[PDB]
Amino acid sequence: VNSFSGYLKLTDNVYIKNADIVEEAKKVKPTVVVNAANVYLKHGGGVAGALNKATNNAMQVESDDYIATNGPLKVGGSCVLSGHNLAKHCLHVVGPNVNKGEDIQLLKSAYENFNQHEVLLAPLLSAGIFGADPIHSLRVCVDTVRTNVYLAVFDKNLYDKLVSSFL
Numbered sequence: 001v002n003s004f005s006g007y008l009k010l011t012d013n014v015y016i017k018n019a020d021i022v023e024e025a026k027k028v029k030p031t032v033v034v035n036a037a038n039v040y041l042k043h044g045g046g047v048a049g050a051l052n053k054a055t056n057n058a059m060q061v062e063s064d065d066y067i068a069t070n071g072p073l074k075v076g077g078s079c080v081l082s083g084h085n086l087a088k089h090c091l092h093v094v095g096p097n098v099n100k101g102e103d104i105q106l107l108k109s110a111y112e113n114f115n116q117h118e119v120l121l122a123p124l125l126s127a128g129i130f131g132a133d134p135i136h137s138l139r140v141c142v143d144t145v146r147t148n149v150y151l152a153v154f155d156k157n158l159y160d161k162l163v164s165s166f167l
C-alpha cells in the first residue's frame with residue numbers, strides 16, 4: 001500500500017491521473033519524482049521548468065554542479081539527484097526531443113531507467129514540448145516499465161484521450 005490517490009489503473013504496474021506533477025509531488029513526497037530533463041539539465045520550461053520553479057531554483061543549482069563535474073547526460077540516459085522539497089530523489093531522464101531531430105527509438109531506453117526504482121511519480125517522456133506523440137509514449141511506457149509508475153498528465157483533454165484510446 002502506498003499514498004497515491006485518484007489514479008486509474010491501466011495495467012498491473014502502470015497508473016494514470018490528471019494532475020499537476022508539482023502539486024502531486026508536494027502532497028505525496030514520493031521517493032522518486034521523474035523530471036523530463038535535457039542532456040544539459042537546463043530546466044527552462046515544460047515539466048522541468050515547473051519542477052525547478054517549485055524548488056526555488058535549487059534543482060538548477062544542484063544540476064549545474066552535476067554537469068560541471070560529469071558533463072552532459074546521454075539522450076536516453078538519466079541521473080539521480082535530490083528531490084528537494086518535492087520528493088526524496090529526482091530521477092532526471094532524457095527522452096528524445098523530436099523538435100531537435102532525436103531518434104524516437106531512444107524513448108524505450110529512456111523508460112528503462114524507471115526500472116531501477118520500485119515506485120515512481122512521472123510524466124510521459126518526450127511528450128509536451130519534447131514533441132513526441134503522447135499516445136506512443138504511453139504505449140512505450142506500458143511495454144517497457146516493470147516497476148510501479150504513477151503517471152501525471154497535466155492536460156485534461158489529453159488525459160481523457162490517453163484513457164479512451166488505451167489498448
Ligand SMILES: CCNc1ncc(C(=O)NCCn2cnc(C(=O)O)c2)s1
Nearest residue numbers: 021022046047050123127128152153154
Ligand atoms: C507556483 C508554481 N508555478 C507553476 N505551477 C505549475 C506550472 C506548470 O507549467 N505545470 C505544467 C508543466 N507540465 C506538467 N506536466 C506536464 C506534462 O507534460 O504532462 C507539463 S508553473
